[PDB]
Design a protein around this ligand. Structure first.
Ligand SMILES: [Ca+2]
Ligand SMILES: [Ca+2]
Ligand SMILES: [Ca+2]
Ligand SMILES: [Ca+2]
Ligand SMILES: [Zn+2]
Length: 316
C-alpha cells in the first residue's frame, strides 16, 4: 500500500520485544519499505487461502497473542534480507530486490512452514509438536533460502538434488541464526519445537544421527518416502558443512575447521555459480572444491578442508 514508513513495536512468539518496520495509511501495516521493494506480512486467518490479508493494526503496537507470529515472520524476514545483502551482496532472493511476502496463521494446528514458490507460509503448530514456526529464525531463513535456491541452482526437490536443496536451507538458516547471534547453534528448529521438551530439535547438523538422519553416504535413504529422503539425506550434506566450519574427526577422517564465514562464502558461491537443477552429492563436492579454489587458492587450507569433509561423509 502507499503510505509513510513508520516503526512499530511488539512481542514475538517467545515473548521478546522488538521493533518492526511498518507503513501508515489509516491503519498501520506490516509493510517494511526499508529493504528492497518491501517485506510484506499477511494474515491467513486460520485458513489455507493465500496470501490472506496484508496485516493491518490500528495503533502500531503488536503485543496481542495473535500478533506474535506476524511480528516474528516480519522481523526475521528482515534479518534474513540483511544477511544476504550484507554478507553475500545479494538483494533479496532473486538478486533484484523482489518483495518478500509471508503469511502466518496458516490453517489450524499446522505443524509446518514452507516456501510455496512465491511466498513464505507459517503454521501456528498444534502447541505440542510446534508453537508458531515463525518464532524460529532458522526456520524463517531456511524457507527464504528455498527462494534463493529456486532462483539460482534450481535444485530439483527429489533424491540427491532435493537433499542438497534441503541442506542448503539448513546451512544458511543456521548461518542467519549465527548472524543474528541469539542463542546460535547447529540445530534446526529448536526455538519452536516441542515446547514441553528441553534441548531437542527437528534436525542436527552437528550430529544428524541424533534424530535418525544419516551422517555418511553409506547410510543414505534410498526409498521413495519424503521425495526420496530430501529431509533425511540432507544430514549427509549438513554434516559435511558442519565439519568444514567447525572441524572434527568423523569415522576416522579428520577435518580442520575453517569457520562459519568461509563455509558461507564457499557454499553461496557453489549455489550461485556451479550447482544446477540435477546436481548430485558428488557434483556438490566438485562445486564446493571449485568454489573454495576460486576464493582461497588450490593449495589453501580451505580447499583441503572441503575435500576432507566430503571424504568424512563418504562423498567422492
Ligand atoms: Ca495493535
Ligand atoms: Ca538457537
Ligand atoms: Ca538453530
Ligand atoms: Ca523442544
Ligand atoms: Zn526445506
Amino acid at each position: 500500500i502507499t503510505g509513510t514508513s513508520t516503526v512499530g513495536v511488539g512481542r514475538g512468539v517467545l515473548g521478546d520485544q522488538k521493533n518492526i518496520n511498518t507503513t501508515y495509511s489509516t491503519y498501520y501495516y506490516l509493510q517494511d519499505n526499508t529493504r528492497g521493494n518491501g517485506i510484506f506480512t499477511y494474515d491467513a486467518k486460520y485458513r489455507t487461502t493465500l496470501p490472506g490479508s496484508l496485516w493491518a493494526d490500528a495503533d502500531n503496537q503488536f503485543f496481542a497473542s495473535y500478533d506474535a507470529p506476524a511480528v516474528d515472520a516480519h522481523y526475521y524476514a528482515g534479518v534474513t534480507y540483511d544477511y544476504y545483502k550484507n554478507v553475500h551482496n545479494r538483494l533479496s532472493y532473486d538478486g533484484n530486490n523482489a518483495a518478500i511476502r509471508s503469511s502466518v496463521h496458516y490453517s489450524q494446528g499446522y505443524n509446518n512452514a514452507f516456501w510455496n514458490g512465491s511466498q513464505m507460509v507459517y503454521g501456528d503448530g498444534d502447541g505440542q509438536t510446534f508453537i508458531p514456526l515463525s518464532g524460529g529464525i532458522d526456520v524463517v531463513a531456511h524457507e527464504l533460502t528455498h527462494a534463493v535456491t529456486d532462483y539460482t541452482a534450481g535444485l530439483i526437490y527429489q533424491n540427491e538434488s532435493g537433499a542438497i536443496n534441503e541442506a542448503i536451507s539448513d546451512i544458511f538458516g543456521t548461518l542467519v541464526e549465527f548472524y543474528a547471534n541469539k542463542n546460535p547453534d547447529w540445530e534446526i528448529g529448536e526455538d519452536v519445537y516441542t515446547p514441553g521438551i528441553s534441548g531437542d530439535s527437528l534436525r542436527s547438523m552437528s550430529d544428524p544421527a541424533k534424530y535418525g538422519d544419516p551422517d555418511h553416504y553409506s547410510k543414505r535413504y534410498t526409498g521413495t518416502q519424503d521425495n526420496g529422503g530430501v529431509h533425511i539425506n540432507s544430514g549427509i550434506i549438513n554434516k559435511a558443512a558442519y565439519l568444514i566450519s567447525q572441524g572434527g574427526t568423523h569415522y576416522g577422517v579428520s577435518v580442520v575447521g575453517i569457520g562459519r564465514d568461509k563455509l558461507g562464502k564457499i557454499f553461496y558461491r557453489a549455489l550461485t555459480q556451479y550447482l544446477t537443477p540435477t546436481s548430485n552429492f558428488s557434483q556438490l563436492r566438485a562445486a564446493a572444491v571449485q568454489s573454495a579454489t576460486d576464493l582461497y587458492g588450490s593449495t589453501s587450507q580451505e580447499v583441503a578442508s572441503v575435500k576432507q569433509a566430503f571424504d568424512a561423509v563418504g562423498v567422492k
